[PDB]
Amino acid sequence: MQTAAISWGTTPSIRVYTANGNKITERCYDGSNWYTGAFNQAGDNVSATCWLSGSAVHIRVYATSGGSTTEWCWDGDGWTRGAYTGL
Amino acid sequence: MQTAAISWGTTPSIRVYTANGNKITERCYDGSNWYTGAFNQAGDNVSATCWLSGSAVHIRVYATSGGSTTEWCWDGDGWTRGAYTGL
Amino acid sequence: MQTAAISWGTTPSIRVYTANGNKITERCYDGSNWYTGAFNQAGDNVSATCWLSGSAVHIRVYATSGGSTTEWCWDGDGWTRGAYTGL
Ligand SMILES: CC(=O)N[C@@H]1[C@@H](O)[C@H](O[C@@H]2O[C@H](CO)[C@H](O)[C@H](O)[C@H]2O[C@@H]2O[C@@H](C)[C@@H](O)[C@@H](O)[C@@H]2O)[C@@H](CO)O[C@H]1O
Numbered sequence: 001m002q003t004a005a006i007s008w009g010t011t012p013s014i015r016v017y018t019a020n021g022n023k024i025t026e027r028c029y030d031g032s033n034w035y036t037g038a039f040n041q042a043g044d045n046v047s048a049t050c051w052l053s054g055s056a057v058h059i060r061v062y063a064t065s066g067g068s069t070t071e072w073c074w075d076g077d078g079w080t081r082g083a084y085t086g087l
Numbered sequence: 088m089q090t091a092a093i094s095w096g097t098t099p100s101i102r103v104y105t106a107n108g109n110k111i112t113e114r115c116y117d118g119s120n121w122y123t124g125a126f127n128q129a130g131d132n133v134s135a136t137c138w139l140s141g142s143a144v145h146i147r148v149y150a151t152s153g154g155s156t157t158e159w160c161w162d163g164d165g166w167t168r169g170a171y172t173g174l
Numbered sequence: 175m176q177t178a179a180i181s182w183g184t185t186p187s188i189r190v191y192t193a194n195g196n197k198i199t200e201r202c203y204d205g206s207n208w209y210t211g212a213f214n215q216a217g218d219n220v221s222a223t224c225w226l227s228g229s230a231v232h233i234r235v236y237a238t239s240g241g242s243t244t245e246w247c248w249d250g251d252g253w254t255r256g257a258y259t260g261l
Pocket residue numbers: 015026028030036037038039057059074
């Protein structure tokens with residue numbers, strides 16, 4: 001089991017991505033209780049980073065399985081495959 | 088052996104968390120010397136994130152031992168166990 | 175394969191570091207296409223963190239190989255080994 005953690009804002013909001021058995025899942029905190037997030041994608045290894053544009057959070061998750069990394073993008077309207085390619 | 092790194096402030100401060108032998112230790116930089124920090128807890132995988140309220144640094148460390156992740160919290164006066172649970 | 179991801183600014187700029195086949199390479203996004211960065215060092219594990227000084231980025235990459243971690247520094251003018259020592 002392996003995790004990546006990101007946070008933003010003043011509350012703050014926190015996201016923790018966990019890779020286990022080639023699935024990555026997400027736990028979220030937005031100032032109250034922890035809840036299971038909408039992120040669900042394949043991966044044995046995960047890293048993540050985020051930034052704010054004004055009030056909007058943008059997240060990028062790098063999900064690696066085998067020898068292959070897929071970027072997954074949150075920009076406010078669902079998780080979408082990003083343009084990242086590796087070496 | 089596996090690490091996690093955070094930073095904050097204009098100096099900046101840096102914390103590096105290392106998981107080896109199912110212990111996680113902490114090396115710190117506050118502008119001067121590297122030094123071993125107050126943090127340690129069990130874990131063989133580690134992620135971390137942090138934010139400022141000014142004023143005070145706040146650090147969350149996610150220590151995974153086997154199939155369980157524990158959150159450990161720095162909010163300016165000691166490490167305390169966080170409300171995080173997994174799936 | 176294992177990755178670490180950092181980002182800065184509003185474009186944003188992203189760097190993703192990937193340890194694979196016992197070496198760590200870098201993929202870079204500055205607002206258009208992805209490209210392969212100058213970071214290249216030995217290691218089985220990588221973590222990283224960054225901060226801005228105005229619009230100048232500073233990156234610290236912690237490359238681990240065996241029971242030892244080497245810190246690598248970007249401060250505008252190439253990569254330089256940093257003062258980090260482990261336990
Ligand atoms: C109290 C409050 O305002 N909470 C906000 C949340 O509702 C936002 O979570 C996102 O909310 C939308 C509906 O508005 C939808 O439910 C999304 O699934 C949910 O997204 C979560 O957070 C994302 C950043 C991703 O991590 C995603 O996988 C999660 O499920 C959040 C985020 O904008 O803001 C809170 O303030």
